[PDB]
């Protein structure tokens, strides 16, 4: 009569509470150990990147997916090297950046093992004014299509923060992952119309080959009262230079920030990080459009660029991920504002089985918790 | 080119085609954003003043606080209190004086405070009865109930040292006319174990009562399964009388995750902190009826084994207010060879009567060196290639 002591692998045929029904109906397994989309994340400090003594003049952030070509791993990222660290839009000009990603280029690095990288230099330079991206080219991601390579990126036309963090998405292309990279110059993912959620920002472009097409996911900042809202959308294309057609169901993900996705089984998995009600989840859509919570996780990577071996193969059954590159922002202090690249490792893979990536949390000593203390105003409130 | 979702986030679900995730954003939560979600919060921690732990050498441990209550112009809290010649040594090395585990050879002590930051430790509330009475080995993991002007503490009573054969710890109740005690033990079964083969057959842990729907709704946790690991879920049992016996919900488990139970009335329903383990760890959940719980928010750095101050815990409220502070614990506060736990204070906004945007940021983030401490093992590096 009572619920069994041995946890059933399949939903028992008995009256069940709403929470028990959900444990079976909503997740790939009724326990974390067998949930292929539950994981912990481990972090490794990269070697190979110089940040000018971390004085805020050099930043690297928002890595592309990692790919493997020419016997090595490649990664692209936002690279800012300015004499002055970021000063905010009001105090920016042609040489002083507004935000960490202002006045930036796309650079690239290679690696034999994903732990030590060698910086190769510029991939996408800033185009001349007034072309899309002249102010800053940022937040790129990579697609391979019919033997050629495409870097989609945010293309700033005014310093970030002038009205908001505003831009459309542009693209460059190459015959080799070593470049050189030719700009498409036209906008490829446009802003929405007046009054639409994506009218000011198309951020974090992230393409995956799926269902014979290019599924490119992005984020947009909207609302503003009381605060900005961030959600994620989708646009789909038959050719890498477009036309991209936005899903009529955007936003497809109701939380998160920077997009990170990968083919998984017949569907698409997504990391849903930092913001929104469903922050700190991995999510899954059977069709790449209708996303559900697949797991609840902690210490997620920021702006992950995983190694997705099956990102471009038009796979009919995605295997998932186990490592990549991510970032940490404001690595020192705000007056020397800059980001660093980092490595993460996890098990969101059908081809990796490591119970030591599947513990339920990471815990700390009391002193750590006391640092998340009450302010002066809070203690005064009582 | 399709007509787009609007720039201003609507307060109610708009009448337009929506993705499954946008539908859920409106359908499943109390609000379509964290700022207006009364069950979303952060947690802030404050070091308590008043408790000595023998220089943190592991001989003294305090853990599993009760709900905090207000009586006689002051705040009371009860907790597990261990004071032994040696720290815990494991099941194999335990004896009459040597504890096997942090909660072994312990009693229920209590403390009082004018403010909830400095505590005056009053001493024993529930002593270990003489063997072979329920709890002779250790009395632990208590929670408080006020019922028709009297007080009741529910607690685990160990029958042998944790980790040795015969270490059952059934729930016992003691009662008093004053929160100061003295406390009289009741020596009847309060919440029975499940029948053989059932999820709660060996364990009724972390008892936690709330007055609700004219009755006592007592939530607890059970350890079950075991292969590959134990599974923890939470159940409900209800009584007409504080002495019990309590009758189990036929829908147990009512919460599919979590660990130690912590709950509070909220609106016409009941909210719960779902901590550490299970698929739905790190959530606040809500049940309109106290039985059918849904995820209300996802949160981080949740308190362990929280005992909130729940002003309306006992008043049979028809609309609960929620919580904003209480006591919780930290385990293995120093090192394992000196194993002990400490009591801490937590503050939050899970309250209809508190509105603090500085309790409602979406995360707490650190410098790179913090994350590099969560690195790979040599074994993982070798595997990875
Ligand atoms: O424009 C934004 C985009 O790239 C830089 C800015 O912040 C994040 O990492 C991304 O959402
Ligand atoms: Ca990105
Ligand atoms: Ca796996
Ligand atoms: Ca408790
Ligand atoms: Ca509130």
Automatic annotation (TrEMBL), chain A:
Key words, A-Z: Calcium, Glycosidase, Hydrolase, Metal-binding, Signal
Pfam family, one: Glyco_hydro_43
Species whose genome carries this gene: Zobellia galactanivorans (strain DSM 12802 / CCUG 47099 / CIP 106680 / NCIMB 13871 / Dsij)
InterPro entries associated with the record: GH43_arabinanases, Glyco_hydro_43, Glyco_hydro_beta-prop_sf
Positions that bind Ca(2+): 36, 347, 349, 352
Family: Belongs to the glycosyl hydrolase 43 family.
Endoplasmic reticulum as UniProt keyword: no
GO BP annotations, alphabetical order: carbohydrate metabolic process
Keyword Metal-binding tagged: yes
Pathway(s) it belongs to: Glycan metabolism; L-arabinan degradation
Protein name per Swiss-Prot or TrEMBL: Conserved hypothetical periplasmic protein
GO MF annotation: an example: metal ion binding
Classification via PANTHER family: ARABINAN ENDO-1,5-ALPHA-L-ARABINOSIDASE (PTHR43301), ARABINAN ENDO-1,5-ALPHA-L-ARABINOSIDASE A-RELATED (PTHR43301:SF3)
Annotated EC: 3.2.1.-
